[PDB]
Design an enzyme around this catalytic site. Structure first.
Site, PDB file in Angstrom:
ATOM      1  N   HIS A  72       0.803  -1.233   0.000  1.00 52.97           N
ATOM      2  CA  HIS A  72       0.000   0.000   0.000  1.00 52.97           C
ATOM      3  C   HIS A  72       0.821   1.260   0.000  1.00 52.97           C
ATOM      4  O   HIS A  72       0.329   2.326  -0.379  1.00 52.97           O
ATOM      5  CB  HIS A  72      -1.007  -0.001   1.165  1.00 52.97           C
ATOM      6  CG  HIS A  72      -0.401   0.200   2.516  1.00 52.97           C
ATOM      7  ND1 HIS A  72      -0.319  -0.840   3.429  1.00 52.97           N
ATOM      8  CD2 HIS A  72       0.093   1.321   3.086  1.00 52.97           C
ATOM      9  CE1 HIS A  72       0.238  -0.325   4.504  1.00 52.97           C
ATOM     10  NE2 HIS A  72       0.521   0.970   4.335  1.00 52.97           N
ATOM     11  N   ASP A 108      -0.713  -7.831   1.559  1.00 56.29           N
ATOM     12  CA  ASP A 108      -0.093  -6.507   1.706  1.00 56.29           C
ATOM     13  C   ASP A 108       1.413  -6.642   2.022  1.00 56.29           C
ATOM     14  O   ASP A 108       1.876  -6.424   3.149  1.00 56.29           O
ATOM     15  CB  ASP A 108      -0.855  -5.633   2.708  1.00 56.29           C
ATOM     16  CG  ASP A 108      -0.462  -4.179   2.668  1.00 56.29           C
ATOM     17  OD1 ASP A 108       0.114  -3.739   1.637  1.00 56.29           O
ATOM     18  OD2 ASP A 108      -0.711  -3.476   3.662  1.00 56.29           O
ATOM     19  N   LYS A 166     -13.728 -10.787  15.884  1.00 58.21           N
ATOM     20  CA  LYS A 166     -14.862 -10.227  16.639  1.00 58.21           C
ATOM     21  C   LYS A 166     -14.795  -8.702  16.694  1.00 58.21           C
ATOM     22  O   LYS A 166     -15.826  -8.040  16.863  1.00 58.21           O
ATOM     23  CB  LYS A 166     -14.871 -10.771  18.076  1.00 58.21           C
ATOM     24  CG  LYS A 166     -15.348 -12.213  18.216  1.00 58.21           C
ATOM     25  CD  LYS A 166     -15.172 -12.663  19.664  1.00 58.21           C
ATOM     26  CE  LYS A 166     -15.837 -13.977  19.975  1.00 58.21           C
ATOM     27  NZ  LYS A 166     -15.656 -14.348  21.401  1.00 58.21           N
ATOM     28  N   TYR A 168     -13.291  -6.848  14.182  1.00 56.90           N
ATOM     29  CA  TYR A 168     -13.442  -6.375  12.799  1.00 56.90           C
ATOM     30  C   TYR A 168     -14.515  -7.182  12.112  1.00 56.90           C
ATOM     31  O   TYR A 168     -14.227  -7.969  11.208  1.00 56.90           O
ATOM     32  CB  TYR A 168     -12.102  -6.438  12.053  1.00 56.90           C
ATOM     33  CG  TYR A 168     -11.125  -5.390  12.515  1.00 56.90           C
ATOM     34  CD1 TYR A 168     -11.266  -4.058  12.128  1.00 56.90           C
ATOM     35  CD2 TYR A 168     -10.068  -5.719  13.365  1.00 56.90           C
ATOM     36  CE1 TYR A 168     -10.362  -3.081  12.552  1.00 56.90           C
ATOM     37  CE2 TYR A 168      -9.169  -4.746  13.809  1.00 56.90           C
ATOM     38  CZ  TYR A 168      -9.325  -3.430  13.403  1.00 56.90           C
ATOM     39  OH  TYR A 168      -8.431  -2.468  13.786  1.00 56.90           O
ATOM     40  N   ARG A 169     -15.763  -6.989  12.559  1.00 56.91           N
ATOM     41  CA  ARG A 169     -16.958  -7.703  12.080  1.00 56.91           C
ATOM     42  C   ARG A 169     -17.316  -7.429  10.609  1.00 56.91           C
ATOM     43  O   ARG A 169     -17.915  -8.295   9.985  1.00 56.91           O
ATOM     44  CB  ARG A 169     -18.169  -7.453  13.005  1.00 56.91           C
ATOM     45  CG  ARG A 169     -18.065  -8.179  14.334  1.00 56.91           C
ATOM     46  CD  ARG A 169     -19.154  -9.226  14.473  1.00 56.91           C
ATOM     47  NE  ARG A 169     -18.707 -10.415  15.201  1.00 56.91           N
ATOM     48  CZ  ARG A 169     -18.116 -11.464  14.633  1.00 56.91           C
ATOM     49  NH1 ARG A 169     -17.868 -11.469  13.328  1.00 56.91           N
ATOM     50  NH2 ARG A 169     -17.755 -12.507  15.368  1.00 56.91           N
ATOM     51  N   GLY A 193       2.305   6.497   9.324  1.00 58.32           N
ATOM     52  CA  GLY A 193       3.745   6.601   9.156  1.00 58.32           C
ATOM     53  C   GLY A 193       4.537   5.369   9.552  1.00 58.32           C
ATOM     54  O   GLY A 193       5.705   5.288   9.198  1.00 58.32           O
ATOM     55  N   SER A 227       3.361   2.102   8.844  1.00 53.28           N
ATOM     56  CA  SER A 227       3.109   1.005   7.897  1.00 53.28           C
ATOM     57  C   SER A 227       4.366   0.591   7.106  1.00 53.28           C
ATOM     58  O   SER A 227       5.271   1.400   6.876  1.00 53.28           O
ATOM     59  CB  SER A 227       1.938   1.315   6.976  1.00 53.28           C
ATOM     60  OG  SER A 227       2.288   2.348   6.069  1.00 53.28           O
ATOM     61  N   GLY A 228       4.407  -0.683   6.751  1.00 56.21           N
ATOM     62  CA  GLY A 228       5.539  -1.296   6.072  1.00 56.21           C
ATOM     63  C   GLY A 228       6.543  -1.839   7.063  1.00 56.21           C
ATOM     64  O   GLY A 228       7.294  -2.758   6.749  1.00 56.21           O
TER      65      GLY A 228
HETATM   66  N1  LIG Z   1      -3.631   1.137  13.560  1.00 57.76           N
HETATM   67  C1  LIG Z   1      -2.754   0.736  12.579  1.00 57.76           C
HETATM   68  N2  LIG Z   1      -2.114  -0.450  12.888  1.00 57.76           N
HETATM   69  N3  LIG Z   1      -2.592   1.424  11.499  1.00 57.76           N
HETATM   70  C2  LIG Z   1      -1.624   0.824  10.566  1.00 57.76           C
HETATM   71  C3  LIG Z   1      -1.727   1.639   9.293  1.00 57.76           C
HETATM   72  C4  LIG Z   1      -1.257   3.056   9.552  1.00 57.76           C
HETATM   73  N4  LIG Z   1      -1.229   3.788   8.317  1.00 57.76           N
HETATM   74  C5  LIG Z   1      -0.102   4.386   7.811  1.00 57.76           C
HETATM   75  O1  LIG Z   1       1.022   4.291   8.280  1.00 57.76           O
HETATM   76  C6  LIG Z   1      -0.401   5.214   6.602  1.00 57.76           C
HETATM   77  C7  LIG Z   1      -0.381   4.298   5.372  1.00 57.76           C
HETATM   78  C8  LIG Z   1       0.025   5.039   4.142  1.00 57.76           C
HETATM   79  C9  LIG Z   1       1.347   5.052   3.734  1.00 57.76           C
HETATM   80  C10 LIG Z   1       1.745   5.774   2.628  1.00 57.76           C
HETATM   81  C11 LIG Z   1       0.801   6.481   1.914  1.00 57.76           C
HETATM   82  C12 LIG Z   1      -0.525   6.449   2.297  1.00 57.76           C
HETATM   83  C13 LIG Z   1      -0.918   5.731   3.411  1.00 57.76           C
HETATM   84  N5  LIG Z   1       0.629   6.253   6.636  1.00 57.76           N
HETATM   85  C14 LIG Z   1       0.359   7.598   6.423  1.00 57.76           C
HETATM   86  O2  LIG Z   1      -0.750   8.109   6.383  1.00 57.76           O
HETATM   87  C15 LIG Z   1       1.512   8.485   6.226  1.00 57.76           C
HETATM   88  C16 LIG Z   1       2.669   8.022   5.619  1.00 57.76           C
HETATM   89  C17 LIG Z   1       3.720   8.899   5.444  1.00 57.76           C
HETATM   90  C18 LIG Z   1       3.605  10.217   5.840  1.00 57.76           C
HETATM   91  N6  LIG Z   1       4.680  11.112   5.647  1.00 57.76           N
HETATM   92  C19 LIG Z   1       4.637  12.452   5.995  1.00 57.76           C
HETATM   93  O3  LIG Z   1       5.563  13.238   5.862  1.00 57.76           O
HETATM   94  C20 LIG Z   1       3.376  12.960   6.575  1.00 57.76           C
HETATM   95  C21 LIG Z   1       2.359  12.109   6.750  1.00 57.76           C
HETATM   96  O4  LIG Z   1       1.193  12.574   7.281  1.00 57.76           O
HETATM   97  C22 LIG Z   1       2.436  10.694   6.404  1.00 57.76           C
HETATM   98  C23 LIG Z   1       1.385   9.815   6.603  1.00 57.76           C
END
Ligand SMILES: N=C(N)NCCCNC(=O)[C@H](Cc1ccccc1)NC(=O)c1ccc2[nH]c(=O)cc(O)c2c1
Length: 236
Positions: free
Chosen positions: A44, A93, A160, A162-163, A186, A188-189
């Site tokens: 993603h 993913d 339960k 994430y229904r 920020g 993710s990955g």
């Molecule tokens: N509860 C959970 N486990 N959640 C897990 C998922 C969390 N999602 C993410 O990390 C998204 C995914 C995503 C990743 C990349 C693009 C879109 C969405 N990241 C961002 O929106 C994100 C990422 C880099 C950023 N760089 C900046 O300079 C300023 C930003 O605002 C900023 C915000």
């Protein structure tokens, strides 16, 4: 990372910061060193990334202030996204970044072991989520890398919560019933690292969740052990 604390320099040496140069340079995603030329990350992360040419991988980083124009980085040669991936919430993913040059391992940057197929019945109790993401839902990317100990929830329990989604066997969830500790925008990955028998394993990749660290909403991670064949196939 919500309810986390600052990491110490080199305690998560497999953790990378993936930056984009377009329009101006910024952190995009977390990732993990799994090999000399291989970073394991989430699919993603690359939405609207037309070319791997805008990507810069930074290893051995504690603070985002370490990154200036004169800072060495790894160019990306290829983005390999799983062919069954459509979006984070439906699974698959996972993405591999083939670096242009190889990583010279040291105490500051080294690979993380992938879990073996026999470890499918291991009960992980020492699991950490790491990243430079938001400390609250409405925030900004953090200078210093954060860490948080997060317990693994069963796929039955996560389902339960994430229904309206299907939590599959290729997903792993982690969180506190009461919330307060999780990955956020920020992160993710990035890795979900679990220490088992004095060895660290990449158990999950930060993928998705409903908001950040909410009560009865564990974070959802890609279950890495389910992709060890795909990782092998694509790394050849
Ligand atoms: N509860 C959970 N486990 N959640 C897990 C998922 C969390 N999602 C993410 O990390 C998204 C995914 C995503 C990743 C990349 C693009 C879109 C969405 N990241 C961002 O929106 C994100 C990422 C880099 C950023 N760089 C900046 O300079 C300023 C930003 O605002 C900023 C915000």
């Amino acid at each position: 990372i919500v309810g986390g604390t600052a990491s110490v320099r080199g305690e998560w040496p497999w953790q990378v910061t993936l930056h984009t140069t377009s329009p101006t340079q910024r952190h995009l995603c977390g990732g993990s060193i799994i090999g000399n030329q291989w970073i394991l990350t989430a699919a993603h992360c690359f939405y609207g990334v037309e070319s791997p040419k805008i990507l810069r991988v930074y290893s051995g980083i504690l603070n985002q202030a370490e990154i200036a124009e004169d800072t060495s980085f790894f160019g990306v040669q290829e983005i390999i996204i799983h062919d069954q991936y459509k979006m984070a919430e439906s699974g698959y993913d996972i993405a591999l970044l083939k670096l242009e040059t190889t990583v010279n391992y040291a105490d500051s940057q080294r690979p993380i072991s992938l879990p073996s197929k026999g470890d499918r019945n291991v009960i992980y109790t020492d699991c950490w989520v790491t990243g430079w993401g938001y400390r609250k839902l409405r925030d900004k990317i953090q200078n210093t890398l954060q860490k948080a100990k997060i317990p693994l929830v069963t796929n039955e329990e996560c389902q339960k919560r994430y229904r309206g989604h299907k939590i599959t066997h290729k997903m792993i969830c982690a969180g506190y019933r009461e919330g307060g500790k999780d990955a956020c925008k920020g992160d993710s990955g990035g890795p979900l690292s679990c220490k088992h028998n004095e060895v660290w394993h990449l158990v999950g990749i930060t993928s998705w969740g409903e908001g950040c660290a909410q009560r009865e909403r564990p974070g959802v991670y890609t279950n890495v052990v389910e992709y060890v064949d795909w990782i092998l196939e694509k790394t050849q």
